[PDB]
Amino acid sequence: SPVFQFFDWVLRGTSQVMFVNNPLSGILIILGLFIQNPWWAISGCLGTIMSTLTALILSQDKSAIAAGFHGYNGVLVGLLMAVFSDKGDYYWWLLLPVIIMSMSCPILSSALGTIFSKWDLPVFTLPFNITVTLYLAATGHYNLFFPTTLLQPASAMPNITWSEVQVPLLLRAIPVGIGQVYGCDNPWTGGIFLIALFISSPLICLHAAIGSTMGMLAALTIATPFDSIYFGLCGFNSTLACIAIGGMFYVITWQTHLLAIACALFAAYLGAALANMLSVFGLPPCTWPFCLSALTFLLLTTNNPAIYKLPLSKVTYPEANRIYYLSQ
């Protein structure tokens, strides 16, 4: 039936943000981001629905819509306009942009995939980055209709007291850093997202955990204030980068594992850089470090046979990737 098929597609899109396609994973992600905030859940689901509908009415590929490729850029757009909204919870007018902006996610996801299909790169999260970045710039904090939260560049040195670092909270920055991948800051939401990852592929779960760890460690190395680390804002780019490079696209080996750790570190440092830069505009580093770091590590060409990049046409969860590559 068309309705159940479409809802399967939107569930797969919800799960696809973290490289997993299973529908049960989508249900778990949706449940977690309902646990965090039901308003963000409604906005993100509306974004996914409208993005998939646009991909349908734009005659996009049906084998890519059915895999959630055209819906994972809508859930994030909805969620992150429900996050950066100063108007508070249940500002229903905000759903009107959530539709319109989501409708532009497929177009970008097509256009950039005509610039990137020549080098066989995925359009990781760039539709979301472009769309929500232009939304938050167009509206801004000083807007009558859809004001956004005020992000302001640092104007003084942080007062970091290293004797008060909460190591339990520092460890909990891992689940929340994975939770923050959807913009959710609730450790239960991060744990449910991690269960959703583990159900599909354990390698993705492990790489997300170590990506959060690398992000928090990088934030510690560059003297990031502890509140941002505890909140999980320093990890989600690293989690996604570690998932993407380590196993999903590169076949999983120890050399690819080290490359994924390096990509997580590069994505964390670039996340700090882009947070400090875009804070001048009042913008967040919404998955930009991920796109830049994952693309600069996928474009990497090495004479090492162990670092092998799979064709996008034959990419699946890392275990199936390695089985396919060993079968050749």
Next chain:
Amino acid sequence: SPVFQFFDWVLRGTSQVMFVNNPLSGILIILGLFIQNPWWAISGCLGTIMSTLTALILSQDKSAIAAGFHGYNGVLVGLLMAVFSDKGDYYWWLLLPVIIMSMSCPILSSALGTIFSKWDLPVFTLPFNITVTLYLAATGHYNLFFPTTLLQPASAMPNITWSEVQVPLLLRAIPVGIGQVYGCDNPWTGGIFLIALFISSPLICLHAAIGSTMGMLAALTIATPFDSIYFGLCGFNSTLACIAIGGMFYVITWQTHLLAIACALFAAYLGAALANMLSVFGLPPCTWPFCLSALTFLLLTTNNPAIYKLPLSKVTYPEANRIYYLSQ
């Protein structure tokens, strides 16, 4: 004769900003932008002349110079350095940059057309965007020689009173929005530009009008202050985008018409975004939304046979485009 041929080329370049090649259209555009301000007219004509001369002395293609492709990026550069000049009218020293910057328009119009000819995209207005953006950044408002007008990021919520919206002025935002492509804010100038468009191809005129309408409507939807709408600053990117997508490059159908309306809306929202972003640097959104939106809609690939993208080698006014496509 070389002189009359060169003046025909500069007239075609003046007209080509709005996708029209006729020389009579160029004369009408020049007359309109003399009606607005003769100083801007002199600067823009100097820019066109110097850009075409540079394209001649750089051994550029003579079938593209003769079509005004190397002159439409000089008229805008001259006009928009005569617009963003705090020194006032008839500051003759300003002509010295107007030459130099214009001389860099062909080079970009070649260089970018080596990066874009692989995907068969036109270098829409990027020479102008890069050149005048680096000019206004290099000089800035605080410069002894060629100071520019002060564009400053918003620091408080607008005091918009919706009972005082002047619907006649809101409608007049369409002709002035069309005339603002060249920087002119005079409704008579916009009307003359619209006559110039209509003489060549009625579809371009209709798409420019509905592009201005979409720009003003988008500005209303995102609570843009009414002065900017009345001035026509919220439409010109939308007008150009609607001209480009709807008929000029995509063959004209109802699906392409809807896509052109969507591109106008996307260009308006991206224009607000880029105005809010570049205002930090003190820069205007000088045709950047057009380039980004038109390129992201031309790169769009759909399985719909009605949305057909013509090769650039066989692109002309939309009526001839459709006749050629139906003849196949």
Next chain:
Amino acid sequence: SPVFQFFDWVLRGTSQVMFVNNPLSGILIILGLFIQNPWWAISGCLGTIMSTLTALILSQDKSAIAAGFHGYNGVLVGLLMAVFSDKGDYYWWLLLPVIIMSMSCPILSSALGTIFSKWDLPVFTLPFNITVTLYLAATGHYNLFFPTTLLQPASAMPNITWSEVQVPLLLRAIPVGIGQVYGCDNPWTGGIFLIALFISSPLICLHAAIGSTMGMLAALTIATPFDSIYFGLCGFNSTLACIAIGGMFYVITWQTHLLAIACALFAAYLGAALANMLSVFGLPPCTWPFCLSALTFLLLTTNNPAIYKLPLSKVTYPEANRIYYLSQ
């Protein structure tokens, strides 16, 4: 022996910033940038060593490592994090970023060279630009560990008194402008760099000198404060651009010489633009004008047989380039 071969590679990398491969040139550059500041010398040498080691352990091409292609992006990264460091000389902890950031130079130098090898363009200094730009954004002036110098956008008109211009200092802006490629402001360092260039190829030395001259002249034309000109900050992009376009990649003719002068002027104006832009973020224009201008002049396509672009696989010092081209 591996040790002497590796040190030869790092010397060639040190020299390769200015397009010269000789090891004696590398020794002279290192001596000059020890004369300027030994701390910057230590940081830059550490950057070169770590970048070459990373290129070795990433299975990069050994015919490119042996030519210093993977080391010239590390010397600059080390030098320019030792320059933009508010902590003062001999802050040994700064060596820890100098390693990590340098290790990311090869990856970019590979990734961008997969995007640019399709148009046969070199990755000029983009690894350095991206890496140090994200370092200086991530840390910034307000950082507890590795604070950077405060670059702040202009907030008032300069008080330039044209009767006090020191023409001897204005001329000395040429050697110091050449020496500022590596960050050194000492005229003796610039002279030693110029000797190092002249030993390898006189055309590179001449083009560097006239590039500094074009940079200082452009700075004079756009009313740049005299302190920046004397310091040599307005020339190094122009010197490098004149070296690259005039002889190194384009075969050396009078038309290519004029094109190199034009590229130096464009790089100087773009350097002012990018200094004014990136100063909002607190960032310097660290070789960005060079990459943008050299790439937009290499992508230039002309019907002039004298303006000929050599394949990167057969590029050497300009004299050998012309001999090869005449031999055909």
